[PDB]
Ligand binder design. Sequence first.
Ligand SMILES: CC(=O)OCC[N+](C)(C)C
Length: 278
Amino acid sequence: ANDTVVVGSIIFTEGIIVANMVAEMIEAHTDLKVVRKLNLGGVNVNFEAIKRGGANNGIDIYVEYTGHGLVDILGFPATTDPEGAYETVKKEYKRKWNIVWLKPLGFNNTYTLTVKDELAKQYNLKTFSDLAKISDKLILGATMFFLEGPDGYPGLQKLYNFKFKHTKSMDMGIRYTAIDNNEVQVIDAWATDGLLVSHKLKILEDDKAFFPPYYAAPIIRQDVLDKHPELKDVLNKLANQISLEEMQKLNYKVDGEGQDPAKVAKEFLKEKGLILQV
Ligand SMILES: CC(=O)OCC[N+](C)(C)C
């Protein structure tokens, strides 16, 4: 039959690694072949693509974050525990879109606000509220995802009354260079970022609990499951197989050591026995 499915990803390190793992798992454990589609734009492009589906110049599968689905359903930022966010997006995406959330991969790749350790020491910063009190002295460098998202800086700024001198929209790797050079003093470090535990930075505490959980999980069209039911158990073989620490190390293999994400993804799966060597 030569059936194929389309796995989509935004172009960023973690997204392409986990999309590749999904692709490798499908090709290793089923007869299906996988088109890897890369999307440019924000955290909405994959959602609109999966509504279209692989037969309609969209995608069939991608790895989504629970908190993004939660804020999209609610229309307002909220906080809840991981199960609250996961069960809510799973039930709602099935009802409204016939999209199936599979099990979480294991890590929570949340937004953070992060400063240099020395700045945190110079002002005894521990929390977002501590930072807000001195924010009028500081420049924020952040990803376009953070600056444009409803769950990002817009709602965060209003809750804490952040007063940064200005914000600079920056590519993901650039923002680490920028804080290192003191071009900015705060960045939206993401919890799994490969360069994070490598730059002498302090992650501050979200003391008012603005952000939702951001647990990554594969999601798939129901009609693709209807045609290839084996995909559910195959993709759920990834369930809880990637801790925060594991994801950070894979991200660093790409961003810090220059390895290509296809090789990084496949070697991880082989090392953990999730695929066998052919
Ligand atoms: C681009 C993207 O989807 O990144 C997911 C991580 N997060 C929640 C910090 C934005």
